């Protein structure tokens, strides 16, 4: 709808984004403490998605999403490696439908991104 569009345009975001930029360059604004807690937790999720570079072809969003879902279970204070393998085998089965990808080459990329052995994902496939 354009009614939700017009209510955000009239708030003046183009000018306010330009003006807050100038305050940063004039050293009047420091880095927020939410941003410091953000990049400490997120940086492990950013490099694993870039390790899915050698998967080629179609919309690769489901392979990318289910790897991020698999790391999230491993990174808890009480990591659940059973439910982490649940989302991982969906990423392998979503990967092998793309043209050019074998099942073993999808087991290469996902286990290389997650940083675990390839036999753990092979077990739950059956």
């Amino acid at each position: 709808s354009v009614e939700v569009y017009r209510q955000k345009i009239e708030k003046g975001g183009y000018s306010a984004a330009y003006e807050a930029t100038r305050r940063y360059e004039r050293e009047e604004i420091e880095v927020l403490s939410w941003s410091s807690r953000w990049e400490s937790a997120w940086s492990k999720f950013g490099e694993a998605v870039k390790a899915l570079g050698k998967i080629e072809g179609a919309p690769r969003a489901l392979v990318i999403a289910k790897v991020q879902e698999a790391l999230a279970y491993m990174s808890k204070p009480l990591p659940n490696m059973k439910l982490a393998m649940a989302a991982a085998v969906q990423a392998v089965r979503a990967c092998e439908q793309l043209p050019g990808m074998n099942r073993e080459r999808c087991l290469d990329a996902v286990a290389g991104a997650l940083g675990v052995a390839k036999d753990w994902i092979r077990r739950e496939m059956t």
Binding site: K11, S35, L83
Partner: protein, 119 residues
Amino acid sequence: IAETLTEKHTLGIEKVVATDSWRVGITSREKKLERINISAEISRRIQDEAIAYARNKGIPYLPGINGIAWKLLRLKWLGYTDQINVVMRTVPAEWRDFLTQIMENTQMESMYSELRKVR
């Protein structure tokens, strides 16, 4: 001076609190907000069955099995079926029939409610 991702995240927040876009982000939609009502409805419709399932079989109520059965309802709606089969091996034995009860046996009530929520 600087442009990195820690500062890109900050200057996005500083822009929001300047122009007051968060509260007008919610109060301008007012049609998407009814999804909270339909979400809280299925939330109770799963939880009340989990206690009735607990007393019919004499097993203790297992907290979080209402959370598991809500995830499997949504993946069934999308079609992530091999996701389901590994989760069904993870839960205990006496509760596996409850999880397929949330998916299959209440296909009339609960599966229509997710179909109306995403519309």
